[PDB]
Design a protein around this ligand. Structure first.
Ligand code: HEM
Ligand SMILES: [Mg+2]
Length: 375
């Protein structure tokens, strides 16, 4: 069975998508000026030692100058635990269950708009519009303004290979307005914590949460549909047994990891897998490669939606593991379950092929033209 990567030419430089094993699991990369970690055990070691492998990437900026406080992804212990503890109750299974009906209603509304189409782009119809609502609800952003965020996000991703300033100014005004009558929501918790967090900290957290929760989820949705198109026997079984959807989404994350790598900075000289890293060097931890390591996964080149256990690193591991995982799992499940209900047949179009997000550290669909019948 031809993989999505082979069929569509996904990230030829991500050699693990093509079954090739690294020469060694830790290796220095000249173009990025960074150490790459490709192995599962080595990724676990790096992720589990934040004292040596810092997430505060500003430490690598050259002599000179830088304000990332409030961004949990950039924050090391001891502040990391304190900031995460302040916000973590916004991400629980109880919150997931409270938001699920809203996500289901929005999914059905989005599908009504395309249900009669002969062809449509899954990404524009469903995968891009859906994931803003969760982040907007967490941040108490008015329903009126959520469209702004979809536009700004996709625009900024386009520029990278105006919208960011407008988004940040909205976020600063939103922080200032939320101080007027704070409520028992996440914005209020950020405001009330006690030094205290300033609007700069709150804007950093809000920008982080949009980066973290939007396009990742979009890619998960698109990637999973792409996998169903390439593995149609598995897709038929999913359609007939929707309890397979969660394991399908986990295998999609293992096989096409939306976050292909994260970043660390060494704080000291350190040896990993026989390699001598120096202090003040960048380390890229390639979740996508670790997710193909045959020391951990049997037949890692095969897409198997019933793989279980499936301890993939698509949501990370250790202190920074994805706080949004339960929300993302729900969004993917709701999107896929209703898509399959509304379209008894879906196919890619060899004349309008899928395209992929450009970032070298991502693995995901950016456009997915589909046909709703053959003919
Ligand atoms: C399938 C979709 C998603 C993927 C693949 C994903 C991937 C990741 C990964 C790999 C990390 C760890 C990064 C690191 O350790 O350096 C992470 C962290 C994070 N993600 Fe996600 N994520 C997803 C969905 C979400 C959603 C929906 C939210 C918001 C609810 C979110 C918010 C975050 C936050 C806040 C962090 C930082 C956690 C911390 O610093 O402790 N993510 N994500
Ligand atoms: Mg350093």
């Amino acid at each position: 069975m031809t993989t999505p990567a082979e069929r569509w030419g996904i990230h030829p430089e991500h050699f693990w998508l093509y079954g090739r094993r690294p020469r060694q699991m830790v290796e220095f990369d000249e173009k990025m000026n960074a150490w790459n970690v490709y192995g599962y055990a080595e990724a676990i070691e790096v992720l589990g030692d934040p004292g040596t492998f810092s997430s505060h990437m500003s430490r690598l900026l050259p002599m000179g100058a830088a304000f990332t406080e409030g961004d949990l992804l950039q924050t090391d212990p001891p502040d990391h635990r304190e900031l995460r503890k302040l916000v973590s109750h916004a991400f629980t299974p109880k919150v997931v269950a409270e938001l699920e009906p809203r996500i289901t209603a929005l999914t059905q509304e989005l599908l009504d708009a395309v249900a009669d189409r002969d062809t449509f782009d899954l990404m524009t119809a469903l995968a891009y519009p859906l994931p803003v609502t969760v982040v907007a609800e967490l941040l108490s952003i008015p329903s009126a303004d959520r469209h702004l965020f979809e536009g700004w996000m996709t625009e900024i991703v386009h520029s990278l290979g105006a919208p960011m300033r407008k988004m940040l100014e909205y976020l600063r005004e939103h922080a200032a307005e939320c101080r007027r009558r704070p409520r028992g929501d996440l914005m209020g918790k950020l405001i009330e914590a006690e030094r205290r967090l300033t609007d700069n900290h709150i804007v950093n957290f809000a920008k982080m949460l949009l980066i973290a929760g939007y396009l990742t989820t979009t890619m998960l949705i698109g990637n999973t549909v792409l996998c169903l198109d390439s593995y149609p026997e598995q897709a038929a079984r999913v359609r007939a047994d929707r309890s397979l959807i969660p394991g399908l989404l986990e295998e999609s994350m293992r096989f096409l990891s939306p976050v292909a790598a994260t970043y660390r900075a060494t704080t000291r000289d350190v040896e990993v897998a026989g390699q001598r890293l120096s202090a003040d060097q960048m380390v890229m931890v390639w979740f996508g490669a670790a997710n193909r390591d045959a020391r951990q996964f049997a037949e890692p080149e095969l897409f198997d939606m019933t793989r279980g256990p499936n301890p993939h690193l698509g949501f990370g591991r250790g202190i920074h593991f994805c706080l949004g995982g339960p929300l993302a799992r729900m969004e993917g499940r709701v999107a896929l379950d209703h898509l399959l209900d509304r379209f008894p047949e879906l196919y890619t179009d060899p004349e309008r092929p899928p395209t992929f997000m450009p970032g070298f550290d991502t693995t995901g669909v950016s456009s997915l033209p589909l046909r709703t019948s053959l003919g």
